[PDB]
């Protein structure tokens, strides 16, 4: 059965929503990443990566 909202309702009775962003951070091929710009692949030297 269906609910029903109305503007005149008070706090709590107002409508709310929910979102669940499931993630997976194990060592696997990446499909989504942040806006971190990619630098150059310096090789053969002690560097942080």
């Amino acid at each position: 059965q269906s609910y029903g909202f109305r503007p005149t309702y008070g706090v709590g009775h107002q409508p709310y929503r929910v979102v669940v962003l499931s993630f997976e951070l194990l060592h696997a091929p990446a499909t989504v990443c942040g806006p971190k710009k990619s630098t150059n692949l310096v090789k053969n030297k002690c560097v942080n990566f």
């Binding site: 194990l26 060592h27 696997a28 091929p29």
Partner: peptide, 18 residues
Amino acid sequence: TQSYTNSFTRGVYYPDKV
């Protein structure tokens, strides 16, 4: 139509992408 056989050492796959 039906029959029964054995899988000696079959049914193996990499658990994770590592």
